[PDB]
Amino acid sequence: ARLGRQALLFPLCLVLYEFSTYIGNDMIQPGMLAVVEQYQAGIDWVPTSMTAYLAGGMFLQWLLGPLSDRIGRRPVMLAGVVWFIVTCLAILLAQNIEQFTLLRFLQGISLCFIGAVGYAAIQESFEEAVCIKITALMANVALIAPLLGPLVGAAWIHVLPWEGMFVLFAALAAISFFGLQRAMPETATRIGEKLSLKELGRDYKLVLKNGRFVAGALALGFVSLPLLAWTAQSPIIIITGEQLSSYEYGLLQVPIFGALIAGNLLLARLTSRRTVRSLIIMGGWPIMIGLLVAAAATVISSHAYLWMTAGLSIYAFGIGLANAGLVRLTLFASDMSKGTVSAAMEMLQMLIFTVGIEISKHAWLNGGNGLFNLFNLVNGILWLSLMVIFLK
Ligand SMILES: C[n+]1ccc(-c2cc[n+](C)cc2)cc1
Numbered sequence: 001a002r003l004g005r006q007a008l009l010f011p012l013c014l015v016l017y018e019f020s021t022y023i024g025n026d027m028i029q030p031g032m033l034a035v036v037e038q039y040q041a042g043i044d045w046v047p048t049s050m051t052a053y054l055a056g057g058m059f060l061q062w063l064l065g066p067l068s069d070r071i072g073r074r075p076v077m078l079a080g081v082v083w084f085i086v087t088c089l090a091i092l093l094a095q096n097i098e099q100f101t102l103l104r105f106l107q108g109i110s111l112c113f114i115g116a117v118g119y120a121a122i123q124e125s126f127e128e129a130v131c132i133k134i135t136a137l138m139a140n141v142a143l144i145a146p147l148l149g150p151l152v153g154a155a156w157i158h159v160l161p162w163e164g165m166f167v168l169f170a171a172l173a174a175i176s177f178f179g180l181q182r183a184m185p186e187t188a189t190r191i192g193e194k195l196s197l198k199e200l201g202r203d204y205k206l207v208l209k210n211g212r213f214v215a216g217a218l219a220l221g222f223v224s225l226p227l228l229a230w231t232a233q234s235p236i237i238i239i240t241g242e243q244l245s246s247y248e249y250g251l252l253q254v255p256i257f258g259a260l261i262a263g264n265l266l267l268a269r270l271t272s273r274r275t276v277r278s279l280i281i282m283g284g285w286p287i288m289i290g291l292l293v294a295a296a297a298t299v300i301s302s303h304a305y306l307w308m309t310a311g312l313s314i315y316a317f318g319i320g321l322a323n324a325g326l327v328r329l330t331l332f333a334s335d336m337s338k339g340t341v342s343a344a345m346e347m348l349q350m351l352i353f354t355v356g357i358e359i360s361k362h363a364w365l366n367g368g369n370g371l372f373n374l375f376n377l378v379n380g381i382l383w384l385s386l387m388v389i390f391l392k
Pocket residue numbers: 057111142224227319323
């Protein structure tokens with residue numbers, strides 16, 4: 001007898017899935033030093049784990065939304081959960097870092113199911129008032145994962161093997177599979193209809209023609225790249241770069257991702273009395289000053305990692321205050337299907353993350369902290385350059 005508890009279990013398991021796909025990245029980065037050392041791979045493969053994971057995350061959004069609309073939101077979502085489980089277990093059999101990285105890419109495809117079909121079902125199932133509550137919980141999980149992940153991941157690889165992490169990801173996903181199997185409704189409104197890739201290609205051609213949309217989408221990518229670059233490389237900057245331990249590594253996540261949360265909590269308070277664009281200008285100050293301080297500090301003094309951390313913290317506060325607003329404006333910058341717009345901007349900004357982490361990596365390998373931070377400053381400037389057009 002499940003109908004009252006169904007209204008709560010369905011969003012909970014999707015959030016559990018969202019959480020485990022997220023720590024599936026955030027727990028793995030600290031443990032990536034163990035992985036590299038166990039394959040004898042070289043530290044340059046540490047950020048590439050995330051690069052491949054995110055590259056998979058942009059692989060199928062365009063398809064999965066309209067496909068699940070045609071064949072069912074249940075069978076497509078459940079397939080994504082199974083896929084994550086199977087690919088999480090398959091990585092234990094990887095014989096080199098290339099195979100590890102390749103499965104890391106296959107595991108990344110699991111992210112595409114969250115918004116394009118999972119959240120689509122939340123939109124199609126719940127009232128606007130309840131939908132807001134669920135979206136908020138999804139946002140709170142997206143804030144906790146990149147703080148919990150590195151802390152728990154650093155602690156994990158001093159007692160347990162990295163393999164065990166993937167067992168944990170598959171287990172949490174397995175729990176969410178059984179929960180979704182019982183509780184998820186079937187809310188696809190086009191079951192039976194034919195899907196036309198040629199027609200769908202025209203939809204994505206039309207959104208890319210929208211100048212104001214593309215400007216906002218790229219800006220979201222550019223502005224979050226410093227934060228994503230830090231997540232990817234902080235294990236190699238702090239531990240192998242600065243010759244520090246796991247404690248320092250983990251400790252330095254607190255002011256940065258704490259600052260992110262602080263930026264979101266203030267946004268929540270200030271939202272009723274500030275327009276979206278004023279919050280973008282408001283948050284722009286800590287973003288620019290933060291990135292500028294981190295750059296200036298590590299150019300004049302290469303090993304000033306506390307000044308770098310403080311710079312990223314001030315920057316992160318700006319991101320928490322500005323991003324949610326810019327996401328909103330970008331969505332409504334294109335008067336086209338919300339499924340296509342969301343998939344487009346999710347896809348576009350992740351193109352920037354994947355390429356950006358790779359350039360970021362080479363910046364640090366060839367120039368250390370100074371060139372790592374300077375590249376992050378360029379990204380801020382590119383976000384700011386786009387904002388003066390996008391806003392004025
Ligand atoms: C799959 N995925 C999750 C979270 C982000 C994300 C990007 C930028 N920020 C600021 C937060 C979260 C991107 C992709």
